[PDB]
Design a protein around this ligand. Structure first.
Ligand SMILES: O=C1Cc2cc(O)ccc2N1
Length: 123
């Protein structure tokens, strides 16, 4: 139907915006601490601690499959990256501190993304 196509165009548009958001968020992780899934070889007990692992590579895969239906879903995954890290790692670690900085710097980007999605009406 034309309606299905129209909705698919909207999703494709949302995906374009979220790709820009994702790039901006990942730029705030220049150490690439969150670039890839935590290695279960390097950290064999990780899944005993963290029940829903997340990372930028995994988000990017879901994104390119047009797997985010709205900004909320995307934000959920971003928050998993930060929240998982701040639980597994102690306060005095480079990992925890990187998560705090990513959360803080990233709030700015996500604040504008919310306004843009609403105004352009992408969801
Ligand atoms: O959250 C993490 C993931 C990781 C990998 C590693 O080799 C050492 C520490 C930590 N903390």
């Amino acid at each position: 139907s034309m309606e299905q196509v129209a909705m698919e165009l909207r999703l494709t548009e949302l995906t374009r915006l979220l790709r820009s958001v994702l790039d901006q968020l990942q730029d705030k992780d220049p150490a690439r601490i969150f670039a890839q899934p935590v290695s279960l070889k390097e950290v064999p007990d990780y899944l005993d601690h963290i029940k829903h692992p997340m990372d930028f590579a995994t988000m990017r895969k879901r994104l390119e499959a047009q797997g985010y239906k709205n900004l909320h879903e995307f934000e959920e995954d971003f928050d998993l990256i930060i929240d998982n890290c701040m639980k597994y790692n102690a306060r005095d670690t480079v990992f925890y501190r990187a998560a705090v900085r990513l959360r803080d710097q990233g709030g700015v980007v996500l604040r504008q993304a919310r306004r843009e999605v609403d105004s352009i009406g992408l969801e």
